[PDB]
Symmetry: C2
Subunit: 231 residues, 2 copies
């Protein structure tokens, strides 16, 4: 019996081993966001002296990295990254992911765009036949909130403006709102990502499909599976 | 002999006439940004009582509209717009435009997305055989500045971070930077818009091509020409 937390530790450790097996000494590591990514951070901390530091995908991740004395570089200082290690809210058989549930959509997608290899770390619950039962985050310019909402509704999506504990709109780092869209059945993630990216007022869509996972270390009740997807 | 300012007044007046000819009493008018759009604002002000008010594409436009006592609605309050009247930095034969030179890229593209009809108002200098000699504005998340720069450079573009008079980075309403990209020869604006929109870290690209002009009132030294483009 392994709890979800134990499966997350297991994939975090497995990703640290993937990095030490595949990424040479002195490298800068691209680092994701979320509870699973935090397990990877803690595991990577035990070999931190082998690497020059990290690029971070969120304030929360930067904070955790610094709590281990890991140097954090601004992505603008970095020309390339071999690896980016991050979770997913969902991942399908093509390696397309929904991400952004905890809000860091935009910076995750930026760091992922620079990295040669996206290593998804996930417990078994994240692997789904078809994306969309986890609500799709769409980061939007505030003046476009209802325009984008209408476009999502025309697809049968149920758009929910993300709110704080106090019921005022969650606002991201770039002064933007998030619409979490429910009820979509995303049988073609690449095509839907392209469509949503064509909408003025969309900042980032939490479909990582045109650039999805290159591999996934999936923590199951029978151990870690390594899933690989087409370059 | 008509100066450029006189040609801009001429198309502003022509667009006011287009609105009163085509947009019924009580409508809300979508309003662009820039010196040409300001001529249209001044002309529309003379028939302002015929319309309920306006949606604005910038702080500057909101200010000018209010200076005429025109009511300004937040786009989120508005379900549809018949018309959006705005300038362009350049427009080609397909009605594709480069816009954003004066910074309001993102809100212009949002309001344009809601309007059924985009009326471009421009003096004759704006009509070009091929887009790109006017630098292409790309609004970008700051952490993605160099990543997007590299992608533009790979196309032969020369990306220039927009700066204020004091040489600190211009920062937009959403806390974002602008890269003005020179040296592109944009023979397929729709294809390049789609490509740039697929880049994480891009907020808005100042190519209006997938949704371009529906018509253009072009102020020439022989009067206003009405150019029309495929729905
Ligand atoms: K997240
Ligand atoms: K502008």
């Amino acid at each position: 019996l392994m709890t979800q937390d134990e499966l997350k530790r297991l994939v975090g450790e497995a990703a640290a081993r993937y990095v030490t097996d595949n990424v040479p000494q002195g490298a800068v590591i691209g680092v994701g966001t979320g509870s699973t990514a935090n397990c990877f951070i803690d595991a990577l901390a035990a070999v931190k002296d082998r690497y020059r530091g990290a690029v971070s995908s969120s304030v929360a991740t930067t904070e955790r990295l610094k709590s281990h004395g890991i140097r954090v570089f601004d992505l603008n200082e970095i020309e390339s990254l071999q690896v980016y290690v991050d979770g997913a809210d969902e991942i399908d058989e093509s390696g397309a992911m929904i991400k952004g549930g905890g809000g860091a959509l935009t910076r995750e997608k930026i760091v992922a765009s620079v990295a040669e290899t996206f290593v998804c770390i996930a417990d078994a619950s994240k692997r789904v036949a078809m994306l969309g039962q986890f609500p799709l985050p769409v980061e939007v310019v505030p003046m476009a909130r209802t325009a984008i909402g209408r476009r999502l509704a025309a697809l049968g999506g149920v758009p929910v403006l993300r709110v704080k504990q106090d019921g005022t709109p969650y606002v991201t780092d770039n002064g933007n709102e998030i619409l979490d869209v429910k009820g979509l059945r995303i049988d073609d993630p690449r095509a839907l990502e392209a469509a949503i990216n064509g909408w003025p007022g969309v900042v980032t869509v939490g479909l990582f499909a045109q650039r999805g996972a290159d591999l996934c270390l999936l923590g199951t009740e029978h151990g870690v599976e390594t899933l690989r997807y087409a370059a």
